Short mmCIF file of C-alpha atoms in Angstrom, two decimals:
data_model
loop_
_atom_site.label_atom_id
_atom_site.label_comp_id
_atom_site.label_asym_id
_atom_site.label_seq_id
_atom_site.Cartn_x
_atom_site.Cartn_y
_atom_site.Cartn_z
CA UNK H 1 87.49 82.06 97.18
CA UNK H 2 89.39 81.29 100.40
CA UNK H 3 91.96 78.48 100.06
CA UNK H 4 91.56 75.28 102.12
CA UNK H 5 91.58 76.13 105.83
CA UNK H 6 93.94 74.57 108.40
CA UNK H 7 93.22 73.72 112.06
CA UNK H 8 96.53 72.88 113.72
CA UNK H 9 97.04 71.52 117.24
CA UNK H 10 100.41 72.50 118.77
CA UNK H 11 100.50 70.32 121.82
CA UNK H 12 103.86 71.85 122.83
CA UNK H 13 105.70 69.94 125.59
CA UNK H 14 102.69 68.17 126.97
CA UNK H 15 101.16 64.68 127.14
CA UNK H 16 101.22 61.18 128.58
CA UNK H 17 100.50 57.96 126.79
CA UNK H 18 97.15 57.77 128.65
CA UNK H 19 96.10 61.40 127.95
CA UNK H 20 97.09 61.18 124.25
CA UNK H 21 95.15 57.96 123.80
CA UNK H 22 92.06 59.64 125.26
CA UNK H 23 92.41 62.83 123.17
CA UNK H 24 93.18 60.99 119.89
CA UNK H 25 89.99 58.97 120.47
CA UNK H 26 88.06 62.27 120.79
CA UNK H 27 89.58 63.52 117.54
CA UNK H 28 88.86 60.17 115.83
CA UNK H 29 85.11 60.15 116.87
CA UNK H 30 84.58 63.71 115.61
CA UNK H 31 83.28 63.42 112.06
CA UNK H 32 84.44 66.40 110.01
CA UNK H 33 82.16 67.21 107.04
CA UNK H 34 83.98 70.07 105.29
CA UNK H 35 87.29 70.51 103.43
CA UNK H 36 89.90 71.35 106.06
CA UNK H 37 93.42 70.13 106.78
CA UNK H 38 93.68 69.20 110.45
CA UNK H 39 97.17 68.91 111.84
CA UNK H 40 98.40 67.46 115.21
CA UNK H 41 101.90 68.22 116.36
CA UNK H 42 102.91 66.08 119.39
CA UNK H 43 106.29 65.99 121.04
CA UNK H 44 108.92 63.89 119.15
CA UNK H 45 108.68 60.93 121.59
CA UNK H 46 104.93 60.77 121.07
CA UNK H 47 104.98 60.72 117.26
CA UNK H 48 104.90 56.91 116.98
CA UNK H 49 101.97 56.67 119.45
CA UNK H 50 99.97 59.28 117.54
CA UNK H 51 100.83 57.56 114.27
CA UNK H 52 99.48 54.26 115.61
CA UNK H 53 96.21 55.72 117.11
CA UNK H 54 95.11 58.67 114.91
CA UNK H 55 92.77 57.58 112.13
CA UNK H 56 90.64 60.63 111.38
CA UNK H 57 91.13 61.14 107.55
CA UNK H 58 91.22 64.95 107.87
CA UNK H 59 94.49 64.81 109.95
CA UNK H 60 98.16 64.80 109.27
CA UNK H 61 100.95 64.62 111.95
CA UNK H 62 103.55 67.39 112.27
CA UNK H 63 106.76 67.83 114.14
CA UNK H 64 107.09 70.91 116.42
CA UNK H 65 110.70 71.60 115.25
CA UNK H 66 113.52 69.99 113.26
CA UNK H 67 117.11 70.62 112.16
CA UNK H 68 117.97 70.30 108.44
CA UNK H 69 120.50 67.43 108.41
CA UNK H 70 121.38 64.33 110.33
CA UNK H 71 124.78 64.16 112.08
CA UNK H 72 126.54 65.18 115.28
CA UNK H 73 123.71 67.14 116.86
CA UNK H 74 123.08 65.47 120.20
CA UNK H 75 119.46 65.88 121.33
CA UNK H 76 118.06 67.06 117.97
CA UNK H 77 115.83 65.47 115.37
CA UNK H 78 116.58 66.05 111.62
CA UNK H 79 114.26 66.40 108.61
CA UNK H 80 115.54 63.21 106.96
CA UNK H 81 114.75 61.25 110.11
CA UNK H 82 111.18 62.69 110.19
CA UNK H 83 110.68 61.89 106.50
CA UNK H 84 111.81 58.28 107.08
CA UNK H 85 109.38 57.82 109.94
CA UNK H 86 106.50 59.21 107.80
CA UNK H 87 106.25 62.81 109.07
CA UNK H 88 106.19 65.36 106.29
CA UNK H 89 104.81 68.44 108.14
CA UNK H 90 106.83 70.67 110.51
CA UNK H 91 106.26 73.82 112.60
CA UNK H 92 109.24 76.14 112.32
CA UNK H 93 110.14 79.43 113.98
CA UNK H 94 107.66 79.20 116.86
CA UNK H 95 107.96 82.13 119.16
CA UNK H 96 109.13 79.91 122.03
CA UNK H 97 112.06 78.78 119.87
CA UNK H 98 112.80 82.30 118.64
CA UNK H 99 112.82 83.51 122.26
CA UNK H 100 114.24 80.58 124.30
CA UNK H 101 116.26 78.58 121.85
CA UNK H 102 118.24 80.97 119.64
CA UNK H 103 116.19 80.94 116.45
CA UNK H 104 116.88 84.27 114.69
CA UNK H 105 115.10 85.34 111.56
CA UNK H 106 117.96 83.87 109.46
CA UNK H 107 118.02 80.58 111.36
CA UNK H 108 114.30 80.20 110.89
CA UNK H 109 114.58 81.14 107.17
CA UNK H 110 117.36 78.51 106.66
CA UNK H 111 115.23 75.83 108.42
CA UNK H 112 112.15 76.66 106.31
CA UNK H 113 114.21 76.53 103.09
CA UNK H 114 115.73 73.19 103.96
CA UNK H 115 112.29 71.76 104.87
CA UNK H 116 110.77 72.89 101.55
CA UNK H 117 113.76 71.35 99.65
CA UNK H 118 113.03 68.13 101.52
CA UNK H 119 109.31 68.07 100.58
CA UNK H 120 107.82 69.17 103.86
CA UNK H 121 104.74 71.21 104.41
CA UNK H 122 105.90 74.02 106.69
CA UNK H 123 103.95 76.03 109.22
CA UNK H 124 106.32 79.02 109.51
CA UNK H 125 105.63 81.20 112.51
CA UNK H 126 105.90 84.98 112.64
CA UNK H 127 104.71 87.69 115.03
CA UNK H 128 105.61 90.79 117.02
CA UNK H 129 106.15 91.35 120.78
CA UNK H 130 104.12 93.66 122.95
CA UNK H 131 107.03 96.09 122.95
CA UNK H 132 107.29 96.04 119.14
CA UNK H 133 103.49 96.62 118.80
CA UNK H 134 103.53 99.55 121.27
CA UNK H 135 106.43 101.05 119.23
CA UNK H 136 104.26 100.78 116.16
CA UNK H 137 106.70 98.23 114.62
CA UNK H 138 104.19 95.38 113.96
CA UNK H 139 104.23 95.58 110.15
CA UNK H 140 107.99 96.15 109.90
CA UNK H 141 108.65 93.15 112.25
CA UNK H 142 106.39 90.59 110.59
CA UNK H 143 107.43 91.68 107.10
CA UNK H 144 111.08 91.37 108.08
CA UNK H 145 110.47 87.84 109.39
CA UNK H 146 108.54 86.91 106.28
CA UNK H 147 110.99 88.45 103.84
CA UNK H 148 113.89 86.68 105.53
CA UNK H 149 112.09 83.41 104.84
CA UNK H 150 111.12 84.42 101.33
CA UNK H 151 114.72 85.28 100.37
CA UNK H 152 115.60 81.57 100.61
CA UNK H 153 112.60 80.20 98.73
CA UNK H 154 111.76 79.78 95.08
CA UNK H 155 108.29 80.70 93.90
CA UNK H 156 107.20 77.05 93.59
CA UNK H 157 108.29 76.38 97.21
CA UNK H 158 105.43 78.57 98.45
CA UNK H 159 102.99 75.77 97.68
CA UNK H 160 104.51 74.08 100.67
CA UNK H 161 104.41 77.13 102.99
CA UNK H 162 101.76 78.09 105.52
CA UNK H 163 102.22 81.26 107.57
CA UNK H 164 101.11 81.35 111.20
CA UNK H 165 100.73 84.87 112.60
CA UNK H 166 100.94 84.68 116.40
CA UNK H 167 101.36 87.99 118.28
CA UNK H 168 103.69 87.07 121.03
CA UNK H 169 101.55 88.92 123.60
CA UNK H 170 98.63 86.55 122.78
CA UNK H 171 100.49 83.24 123.20
CA UNK H 172 99.22 81.49 126.33
CA UNK H 173 98.26 84.83 127.96
CA UNK H 174 94.52 84.76 127.61
CA UNK H 175 94.71 88.00 125.57
CA UNK H 176 93.51 86.98 122.10
CA UNK H 177 93.93 89.44 119.23
CA UNK H 178 90.66 90.99 118.18
CA UNK H 179 89.31 89.94 114.76
CA UNK H 180 90.20 93.42 113.48
CA UNK H 181 93.82 93.23 114.84
CA UNK H 182 94.37 89.82 113.31
CA UNK H 183 92.79 90.69 109.93
CA UNK H 184 94.91 93.89 109.64
CA UNK H 185 98.10 91.92 109.86
CA UNK H 186 96.90 89.11 107.63
CA UNK H 187 95.93 91.67 105.04
CA UNK H 188 99.31 93.35 104.99
CA UNK H 189 101.11 89.99 104.85
CA UNK H 190 99.09 88.79 101.87
CA UNK H 191 99.66 92.12 100.10
CA UNK H 192 103.39 91.76 100.60
CA UNK H 193 103.30 88.22 99.25
CA UNK H 194 101.15 89.30 96.30
CA UNK H 195 103.55 92.12 95.28
CA UNK H 196 106.82 90.38 96.04
CA UNK H 197 106.19 86.73 95.28
CA UNK H 198 103.12 86.70 93.01
CA UNK H 199 99.37 87.30 92.86
CA UNK H 200 98.69 83.59 92.35
CA UNK H 201 100.88 82.65 95.36
CA UNK H 202 99.08 85.20 97.56
CA UNK H 203 95.59 83.94 96.66
CA UNK H 204 96.47 80.33 97.54
CA UNK H 205 98.59 81.02 100.66
CA UNK H 206 97.11 79.98 104.02
CA UNK H 207 97.77 82.54 106.74
CA UNK H 208 96.69 81.15 110.12
CA UNK H 209 96.12 83.06 113.30
CA UNK H 210 97.32 81.84 116.70
CA UNK H 211 97.45 83.12 120.21
CA UNK H 212 94.68 82.30 122.74
CA UNK H 213 92.31 80.85 120.13
CA UNK H 214 89.39 78.92 121.66
CA UNK H 215 86.13 77.36 120.56
CA UNK H 216 84.18 80.50 121.40
CA UNK H 217 86.30 83.01 119.57
CA UNK H 218 87.33 80.98 116.54
CA UNK H 219 84.30 81.43 114.28
CA UNK H 220 84.43 85.30 114.46
CA UNK H 221 88.15 85.23 113.66
CA UNK H 222 87.55 82.87 110.75
CA UNK H 223 84.91 85.20 109.34
CA UNK H 224 87.62 87.74 108.46
CA UNK H 225 88.57 87.46 104.74
CA UNK H 226 92.35 86.92 105.12
CA UNK H 227 92.32 84.40 108.03
CA UNK H 228 92.62 80.81 106.84
CA UNK H 229 92.49 78.93 110.13
CA UNK H 230 94.38 78.53 113.35
CA UNK H 231 97.48 77.37 115.21
CA UNK H 232 96.10 76.35 118.64
CA UNK H 233 98.14 75.79 121.77
CA UNK H 234 96.26 75.26 125.03
CA UNK H 235 92.84 74.60 123.57
CA UNK H 236 94.22 71.83 121.36
CA UNK H 237 94.81 69.69 124.47
CA UNK H 238 91.07 69.69 125.16
CA UNK H 239 87.97 68.29 123.50
CA UNK H 240 86.93 71.80 122.42
CA UNK H 241 89.52 71.48 119.62
CA UNK H 242 86.57 69.82 117.75
CA UNK H 243 84.61 73.08 117.76
CA UNK H 244 87.70 75.02 116.67
CA UNK H 245 87.89 72.75 113.64
CA UNK H 246 84.19 73.24 112.89
CA UNK H 247 84.69 77.05 113.20
CA UNK H 248 86.50 76.87 109.83
CA UNK H 249 83.25 75.84 108.07
#
């Protein structure tokens, strides 16, 4: 009944040629025997290296960010440029970009809309801060983030969308959400999608959890009915990513 799971490696701003070659070999030698979409998101400058070395058939390569259009945007990489180089997945609205790099709900929504129009699969990130959770604002926050994205999408565009719920207080902190905490948010997100977008859209939508996922906590998170896989930061730089993938069996 669950849709196809996703196991996504957000390498963030990390890697050398040598370390990437070693880790890609690890990923290649791990034979995956179930239906799962694996994703690796290296830094922009490492995309060609990963494209040349990654051969595991369960994997696609994703960018960690993009802007919508080419032009006079020194330092940025656009969606047409990624498409031309063969990258058709992108992570958008990651908490680090919302916090450090000026990505408001509306800016994220515009990027997601443009990526969908350009044929990308999009991992769109949402999630509340510790302060918002303590103020009992978790649902209002994640639904505001999601509805801002939804307002710029047609119903058919949702076939390209994957949501990643990452409580900000769980990102890199060693304080993973409990299975109950994660499931509660995934449930309310799917209910909103069901009632506002469509029951069919909601049944097919992948909602991933991220924030301190590791190989030992992944299977119990995946056992929850509304969790469809993981967006993985620190543990995706390590060979234990193999067991995180296999925790989606």
